[PDB]
Design a protein around this ligand. Structure first.
Ligand SMILES: COc1ccc(/C=C2\S/C(=N\c3cccc(Cl)c3)NC2=O)cc1O
Length: 328
């Protein structure tokens, strides 16, 4: 059987919290007034919810309303409990209210509004300094939620709302987030394909906060190298092959051998043999203004096969890449 694993930091935070902190199945939702919120325009639709811009008519301020599609009550309670636990934290989206939508017959979560620019266009304009600044801001949110016993499990550009005018960032969409408990086996069907960590792609269930650090490394690689997404797999099997063409197959085998994991035999025909690459091969004249020795070393320390070898969020914030970022 597989070798067990523990987070190297914040391992026992939920153990010593009161049970009501992490026992979301017992959470009692405090419902607000559904008539406080007038929907203005639909912003998007996903498989789990629809998202609207709305106005809170008690203060005439914009809010964002996520009306959930039918899903399990425990998953709705999990997201609500996590949002309430994290509320007030650095760069965490604020849950302002929870109401019962009379049409959908489901809960509607009401969030603070961020005047965001879509990442496709925003990422074309970010400078080297901007990328370091916003990476540091994401790390504040990730160290906070990890320190609070929670892994986000869906870090990707679409879930980082940036108001570039005010240099404001919020980490959003906590619907896949979970409480970390030592020894717990988790569902590997989390995160978006391009941001899935190797642990998910080899079906290793006893993972932890370090998953979010792989996803963040994938974001960083796409930004400094101007290739979005960086690891561009056509399915979950090809995703691991794309990773192995950069990190190499020998260290992939070291990873699965450490945890006494077997690869899916369907990789026998597609994985090949690949040396580990040096990050300098991805630098060219059109991205070199975003690349520095510090950026490559930082990236190299996030993108490790072994989840136990990745920088923690706090360690990442100590990295020389962030020395040029102004801290007040
Ligand atoms: C414009 O500013 C904001 C935008 C979004 C949020 C909060 C969201 S959106 C979300 N899930 C999504 C995402 C896309 C489509 C679908 Cl259907 C669901 N999960 C959150 O927490 C908050 C803001 O202030």
């Amino acid at each position: 059987g597989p070798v067990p694993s523990r987070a190297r930091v914040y391992t026992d935070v939920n153990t010593h919290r009161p049970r009501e902190y992490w026992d979301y199945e017992s959470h009692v939702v405090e419902w607000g007034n559904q008539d406080d919120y007038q929907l203005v325009r639909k912003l998007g639709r996903g498989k789990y919810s629809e998202v609207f811009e709305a106005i809170n008519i008690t203060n005439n301020e914009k809010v964002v309303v996520k009306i959930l599609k039918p899903v399990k009550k425990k998953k709705i309670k999990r997201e609500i409990k996590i949002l309430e636990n994290l509320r007030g934290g650095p760069n965490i989206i604020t849950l302002a209210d929870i109401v019962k939508d009379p049409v959908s017959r489901t809960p509607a979560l009401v969030f603070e509004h961020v005047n965001n620019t879509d990442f496709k266009q925003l990422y074309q304009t970010l400078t080297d300094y901007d990328i370091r600044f916003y990476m540091y801001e994401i790390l504040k949110a990730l160290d906070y939620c990890h320190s609070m016993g929670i892994m986000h499990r869906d870090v990707k550009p679409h879930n980082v709302m940036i108001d570039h005018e005010h240099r404001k960032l919020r980490l959003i969409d906590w619907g896949l987030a979970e409480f970390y408990h030592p020894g717990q086996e988790y569902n590997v069907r989390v995160a978006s394909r391009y941001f899935k960590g190797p642990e998910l792609l080899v079906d290793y269930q006893m993972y932890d906060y370090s998953l979010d650090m792989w996803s963040l490394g994938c974001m960083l690689a796409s930004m400094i190298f101007r290739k979005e997404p960086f690891f561009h797999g056509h399915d979950n099997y090809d995703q691991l092959v794309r990773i192995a063409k950069v990190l190499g197959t020998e260290d992939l085998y070291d990873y699965i051998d450490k945890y006494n994991i077997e690869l899916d035999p369907r990789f026998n025909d597609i994985l090949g043999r690949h040396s580990r690459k040096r990050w300098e091969r991805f630098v060219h004249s059109e991205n070199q203004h975003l690349v520095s020795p510090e950026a490559l070393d930082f990236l190299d320390k996030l993108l490790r096969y072994d989840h136990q070898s990745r920088l923690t969020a706090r360690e990442a914030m100590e990295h020389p890449y962030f020395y040029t970022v102004v801290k007040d």
